[PDB]
Design a protein around this ligand. Structure first.
Ligand SMILES: Cc1cccc(-c2ccc([C@@H]3[C@@H](CO)N4CCCCN(S(=O)(=O)c5nccn5C)C[C@@H]34)cc2)c1C
Ligand SMILES: Cc1cccc(-c2ccc([C@@H]3[C@@H](CO)N4CCCCN(S(=O)(=O)c5nccn5C)C[C@@H]34)cc2)c1C
Lengths: 959, 959
């Protein structure tokens, strides 16, 4: 009855708690489409996936597909303005991005629900008539080269591409994917290639409709959505491109029984064991790869990790199948290495095969599969409502692998118990099929090979046959028992009835000298889940560097102890987060409310009654010091962000200060620290979810009663609950802090324009101005000036203060970017004066939409409340209140704000800049916009003297 | 603060290339004010708009609002001299006028920038205490009666007023607006009404301050202007008149599905299709009327016109929204009709609804709106600087509809794309809502109705139900495709830097036997625009009537061929004008310089490689013959000018001479004409704008190279470049040429006093004398003696000669008008001898101001240079040279000039008169001034014998 629709899918099985409406289609051109109607969503979204990726790149232009991704945004035949896509979405509360794997290219966006069509039309044109403007091609390649440069000194990227290079060099697996300036301009222009043809030749050849999948999520009806999708996409051309598949495995015989010794950039000690396996993707109903990954990577009692941990060799273990293109997969076992573990790699790998041998002798266990089936079934029934942008993007990728009807469930539910497949995969996990990778700084200078793309230093050795035989004849270790029935599986999913005296916002149901309990029973989602957030205040968690380290070590030791017990809970959708802060400790417990109080008690009991294993202490204390040193290898812009945090906070310890005081942390002092830390506390907590007021009060008092009994905890005085303040910069001032990054050869910079204390007025002034420049700053500093890959502009909130911040990571010196971002600021002044009165109210409505986006899941709503709480501001109706004021603003109110607080010659300009110089960058001192003349900056020489000479801002009045 | 200012507008968004400064005000009495400060302007200006017009006229005094317009100029209480307003502006390089629509009355003036205050004071008095002197009222009604009489025999006015009468007769839309002697004197004096009371009753009632808008433009600062404006206008009285609005549409049910067959005065064939629609004025941000008007009235490939054109039915199509008062609008589609098109009106209108149905099935196209929004955005950024008199009047009108800040942009920029509104208007365009009007002489005698005001003959028919159903069931025509992306949108707006060897005046950078290229790089405006003027000389373009006709047909056919191609360019701010002259062809290309060489090449290529469509040839050749016959229905004063042009030019072909020889133009002869016309040419060209010297040489060489390749063009001999001379009249001579106008019952006359060849001395003598008599000639012959509505006096320049000319259109016989202008000339003889030495030097400053007015936009500056070029005079510094001499003139030097060249008994009087008698005027032979005695005139019997018996003036020496 319609010629543009090949077929229509039947009922799409969804979670019975899912209110949304779904319809499956296959267009005439073979485009698999899923339509999602959610009349509640404040933002609509859509995404398209092409079953092509890096592996189909031409041999001579590595990275073309990932480059073509960048180039689809920069102009279409119908919408040729270079940034009409970015500009349209920014003005309509939208965002967008895209990624490129080996077999997929995935484009997605979201936007205000009233402009889905306007966005979709502009978005759809990507696959019909893209410009590939020569002017934009020569510019955007720098964004790709900067993107790669960031990754060049990253240990995870260097290993990623190392595995590719280490296998069969003829296999597309070895292809370089990211692409850089060499492979995309220098060498092609060196081989005479016109890249714009190779972009059009590729786009026209592979971007066929038969290899595309589309997901559209909007308020519109399912029928309205169907006509919209058919209207815009039925004109995509079908080329009947055969789906590429790679049956030959990238790792052949000569690539097996090999050992690699790799020099890392950070200070880490890791061991990777890999086995090639066939494409298990088609067995999704039985999922044998995850059955084995569950048992191998198990962290519970009697597990493989437990013994490697007990022997003081490893600390973490990760196992399971690793994805590869159609026709080949891998099986990885990842362990970090202690100092001793590095010397016993032979035994570690043996212990691995001893556990595998155990799994072979016991055979497939139906009860395990039944457990995994039941757990997934629950997780899917009570699946949290996904964000539209992430939801549409994920489904668009999996429409290629599963029938229309199962698309929602295919990745969750299990059906077939296939013990034959388990034994089949378990037989490929053998020493004659193994590949071993060791990463340790100890191989410095002992390497003889280099990886051409990232520079990785490594050495390749064949695994001695003598060692293989030891692994093959793997005796059974009596320390490896199969896991037992998970006792944390939830059984009570009953949604408690909504109390009469219930509230819409969290209520303060307890305000004692020791506790302060915020409570709200969930009235929006009705899932058997709850979030339990606790802030423990103790002035002894950050009083000096020595105590900060012990605060960290105290918890890292505590969590290490509970891992065996708690791992079962984690599997049962019941997790806990525990870590130190600058004000004390933070404990979060989210998941199914059934077994929740049982886990929380075991945590608080273990807190107050903790006994330290000396062997574990010395191992974590070491790993912690490497984690501090390894900060020198972070991105230059993260250095800038780190340093600025140090400069503007009243009290704050540098990594160097902590690292020095860490040697003085003897176990005696740590054993004495804990009881000192727990002796006086104040507890501010948020209990939010499927639980009643009375149960919530019981939770809080249980944490109190446990601490009082076993730690003899007393309350704090209200005068002790002092929050740290932010430094008050002087009017017309400009400070510059200069440091270097010894690792990365990129430069970084953060620029902080300090406004004033947070307030309903000063908040919206900033948030609106940052909305108007959000997009143009990206188009000017990256798309045009191509300063780098990382260009961020937005508000900075901290310690009750705020301001505008720019963050750039580039190849240029920072003092250049200073002028360029300063020159851009004057570009905005005009752009505002010329901005129409209507285009202005557009931005206001854009900010108001993003500010009033309703939280989709319980976890997200809790954050809003938890943010108002830790901030001591307690403004739970901030969104309605602040949006109301925002709409009353005029274009003139913004101009006076810029002229008064921000402009280069403003009277109240508060500017502080952080310059992070590239590794080899010498000590710093046309068709572009004019940069203003800048005053002489005051150069911070010492951070402590800097703060002593400046006032401190007050603290925000609460409520 | 200030109490006389209700509020002050913030930054008024302006074009970012606009140097002027703007401030918005709302006075206490509700007068919306815009202040324009332009310290560059040579002329200051101001204008006031009243939101009242013809529609608010009393039912018994049709035209009162348009009558009150004429009456405010004739005296004020503070300035009671009847012409103190007209006189003041004339003595200070000023001008003024005003018009009256259905909802507005708009007064405006300009004046020397040093006298804005003096003029504004006199101007403001219009709305405070006007005289309405009874003596002037009885006189000015003739000025209104003559204005209507002019329009009585005009086809556009007769249709205008016909539609009004054809709708609801109770609706103010049906009101007579222009007013004549009947509605303002004869009928009122018969019903006892005192018109002078109704003028004050109306003025006092409707001329309220709350319905006024004021714009003042001057060199003064925005504050000084603000003080001036408030001083003079804050004393206007606020009556709180409610703004009239007309929600009832003039066309109700009984007025729809009607057809009208109308007899025109000219021989024309037109078809008007109208649909009543609601007042779309409020949806101005999205403007759905222009989206549909854009697509319907589109002339590109696949458009409605192309198929109606291809079927040989129409030649032009016009579409869009037609303005009506608040609460109702119209939608018109205007197509001319070929001979065959006249017989296929049913099918033509069907083809109309077939196209509309196409627009409904494809629905609104957002990419189209984005093209219009981006195109308008460009045009506004690079907006040419407007003349003060026109700018203030246009802005004064739109201050009533938009906020103070948006006034400048409201009518240019678009923002919201509202497909819901587009579907709303597209639904009002349906056959059951249509009104059809056919205009053709073929309905002569077959009409049964007459329009009471203009006498229009028409017949009213109901559209048969059978025809309506056919139109409704409009199949989709495969010949109607949506327009495609406009490829002429400019992308390179780069302002080229000013070359070192640049000049202030056009330089002659090429002087060959074939070309002579004048060049100037724009050094004043710096917009991405350029003007390309070309004069092609061929002696075969005017050798005889047959060749003159083929010159016209050649270009009119060529433009017809290019229209489909060039229409896109027109939209992209890139237009071209092409037409024949008495020396050859003239091709002009103005607009954005980016895509300019692409269009110029396609024109010159099409010139030399032109192939004639036989069907189009016969259609234009017919339409061209009607255009010649239809000249008999032009204004009598236009006949007088036409005849005088024939008498005084060496060679000149009459309409009758061409029209008879037009039958002999067979297509073969035209095909042979073109290559002969192109075989030998001389090209004199002016390239001026945003372009370099070498780019200019590149432009010319392409025009040359293209002509040589495809037309084998050879140069002309210098002796072939013969210009036409003007007849040398004998001293003390007087000739009279008498003809009739068969259409209009008014008489016309031009009087030419020939002085001598143009020269810096003889030029300024005339230009000054015409300045002194400029105003008094209007005040004496119209304001006092009320000879008619059209009374013009000024210099006449032609073929290197000059002289003084009077032009009057009256009801009186011409030979009477002859004496009156002679009687006025003696009035001036006295007025000069008695004129003060101060009043004399005032006129000198008046002429000097107007001569030295700097051009505001590029198009205007090119004209000044282009005039010097075609005139073979090449005096680019004429204004400074002539004004310098002008100041050295004395009152005595003028008197001797009059006694010698102009006076009735001067020794060198050279007088020639043209008498055009009204249709029914018999063959022509108090308190007023004494008319002098005139000699016996020599009566021109044949124009050729006239020229044969007289010498010919030389030609002006250049440089
Ligand atoms: C020379 C050689 C021999 C044998 C194996 C390897 C090898 C293979 C893959 C990796 C990937 C690389 C990014 O692709 N890394 C990031 C750090 C650890 C996280 N994970 S993961 O834990 O392995 C992993 N992801 C999915 C499942 N699981 C278990 C990815 C690992 C690293 C090293 C090499 C390089
Ligand atoms: C009895 C009857 C029924 C239906 C319609 C009409 C009717 C109404 C108005 C007109 C006017 C007439 C003089 O006012 N013309 C000028 C030539 C064609 C141009 N246009 S225009 O398209 O609106 C138009 N020019 C410029 C922009 N735009 C939108 C007006 C048309 C002509 C005919 C009548 C008289």
């Amino acid at each position: 009855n319609n010629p543009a629709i090949k077929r229509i899918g039947n009922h799409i099985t969804k979670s019975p708690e899912d209110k949304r409406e779904y319809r499956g289609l296959e267009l005439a051109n073979g485009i698999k489409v899923l339509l999602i109607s959610d009349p509640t969503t404040d933002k609509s979204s859509a995404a398209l996936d092409v079953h092509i990726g890096s592996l189909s790149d031409p041999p001579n232009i590595a990275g073309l597909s990932h480059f073509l991704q960048h180039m689809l945004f920069l102009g279409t035949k119908k919408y040729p303005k270079e940034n009409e896509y970015s500009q349209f979405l920014s003005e309509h509360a939208g965002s967008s991005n895209a990624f490129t794997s080996g077999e997929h290219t995935n484009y997605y966006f979201d936007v205000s629900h009233e402009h889905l069509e306007g966005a979709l039309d502009r978005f759809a044109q990507f696959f019909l008539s893209p410009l590939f403007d020569e002017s934009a091609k020569d510019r955007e390649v720098n964004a790709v080269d900067s993107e790669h440069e960031k990754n060049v000194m990253n240990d995870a990227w260097r290993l990623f591409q190392l595995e590719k290079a280490t296998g069969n060099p003829k296999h597309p697996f070895s292809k370089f994917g990211t692409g850089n300036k060499y492979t995309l301009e220098t060498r092609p222009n060196q081989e005479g290639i016109d890249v714009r043809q190779e972009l059009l030749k590729f786009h026209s050849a592979y971007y066929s409709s038969n290899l595309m999948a589309v997901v559209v999520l909007g308020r519109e009806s399912l029928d309205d959505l169907t006509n919209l999708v058919v209207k815009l996409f039925s004109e995509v051309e079908n080329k009947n491109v055969p789906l590429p598949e790679f049956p030959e495995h990238p790792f052949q015989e000569e690539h097996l029984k090999q050992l690699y010794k790799i020099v890392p950039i950070k200070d880490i000690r890791n061991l990777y064991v890999t086995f090639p396996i066939p494409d298990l993707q088609k067995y999704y109903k039985s999922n044998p790869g995850h059955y084995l990954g569950h048992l191998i990577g198990h962290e519970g009692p009697g597990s493989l990790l437990s013994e490697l941990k007990s022997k003081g060799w490893v600390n973490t273990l990760v196992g399971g199948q690793k994805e590869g293109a159609r026709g080949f997969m891998f099986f990885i076992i990842n362990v970090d290495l202690t100092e001793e573990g590095l010397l016993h790699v032979e035994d570690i790998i043996l212990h691995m095969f001893q556990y595998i041998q155990k799994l072979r002798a016991e055979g497939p266990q139906e009860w395990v599969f039944q457990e995994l089936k039941d757990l997934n079934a629950v997780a899917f029934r009570f699946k949290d409502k996904e964000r539209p942008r992430g939801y549409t993007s994920k489904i668009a990728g999996i429409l290629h692998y599963y029938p229309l009807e199962e698309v929602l469930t295919a990745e969750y539910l299990l059906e077939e118990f296939r013990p034959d497949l388990i034994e089949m995969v378990l037989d490929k996990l053998r020493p004659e099929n193994v590949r071993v990778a060791i990463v340790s700084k100890s191989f410095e200078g002992k390497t003889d090979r280099t990886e051409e793309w990232y520079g990785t230093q490594y050495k390749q050795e064949a695994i001695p046959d003598e060692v293989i035989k030891k692994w093959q004849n793997a005796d059974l270790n009596g320390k490896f028992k199969l896991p037992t029935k998970n006792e944390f599986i939830p059984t009570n999913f009953e949604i408690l009835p909504l109390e009469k005296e219930a509230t819409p916002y969290p209520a303060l149901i307890k305000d004692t000298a020791m506790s302060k309990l915020w409570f709200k029973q969930d009235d929006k989602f009705f899932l058997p889940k709850a979030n339990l957030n606790f802030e423990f205040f103790s002035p002894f968690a950050y009083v000096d560097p020595l105590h900060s380290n012990m605060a960290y070590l105290y918890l890292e030791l505590l969590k290490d102890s509970l891992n065996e017990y708690a791992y079962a809970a984690e599997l049962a959708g019941l997790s806990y987060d525990l870590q130190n802060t600058i004000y004390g400790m933070y404990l979060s417990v989210k998941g199914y409310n059934d077994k929740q109080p049982i886990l929380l008690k075991k945590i608080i009991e273990k807190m107050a009654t903790f006994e330290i294993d000396e062997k574990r202490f010395e191992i974590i204390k070491e790993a912690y010091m490497r984690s501090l040193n390894n900060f020198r290898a972070e991105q230059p812009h993260q250095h800038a962000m780190y340093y600025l945090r140090l400069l503007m906070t009243e009290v704050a310890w540098t990594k160097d200060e902590l690292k020095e005081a860490l040697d003085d942390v003897t176990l005696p002092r740590l054993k004495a620290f804990i009881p000192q830390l727990l002796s006086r506390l104040h507890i501010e907590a948020l209990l939010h979810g499927n639980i009643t007021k009375q149960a919530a009060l019981g939770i809080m008092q249980m944490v109190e009663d446990t601490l009082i009994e076993h730690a003899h905890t007393k309350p704090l005085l209200p005068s002790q609950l002092v929050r740290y303040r932010e430094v008050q910069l002087p009017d017309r001032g400009w400070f510059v802090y200069q440091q270097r990054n010894e690792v990365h050869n990129n430069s970084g910079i953060e620029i902080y324009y300090q406004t004033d204390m947070q307030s309903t007025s000063e908040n919206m002034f900033l948030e609106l101005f940052a909305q108007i420049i959000s997009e143009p700053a990206f188009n000017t500093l990256r798309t045009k000036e191509q300063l780098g890959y990382i260009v961020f502009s937005g508000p900075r909130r901290a310690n009750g203060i705020q301001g505008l911040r720019f963050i750039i990571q580039s190849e240029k010196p920072p003092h250049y970017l200073e002028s360029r971002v300063e020159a851009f600021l004057i570009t905005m002044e005009k752009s505002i004066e010329d901005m129409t009165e209507e285009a202005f109210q557009k931005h206001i409505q854009a900010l108001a939409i993003r500010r009033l986006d309703k939280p989709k899941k319980l976890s997200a709503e809790s954050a809003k409340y938890w943010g108002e709480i830790i901030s001591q501001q307690y403004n739970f109706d901030r969104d309605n209140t602040e949006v109301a004021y925002l709409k009353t603003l005029t274009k003139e109110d913004i101009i006076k704000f810029y002229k008064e607080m921000l402009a280069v010659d403003a009277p109240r300009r508060h500017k502080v800049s952080v310059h992070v110089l590239a590794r080899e960058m010498d000590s710093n001192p046309i068709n572009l916009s004019q940069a203003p003349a800048l005053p002489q900056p005051e150069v911070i020489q010492n951070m402590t003297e800097f703060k002593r000479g400046l006032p401190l801002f007050p603290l925000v009045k609460p409520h």
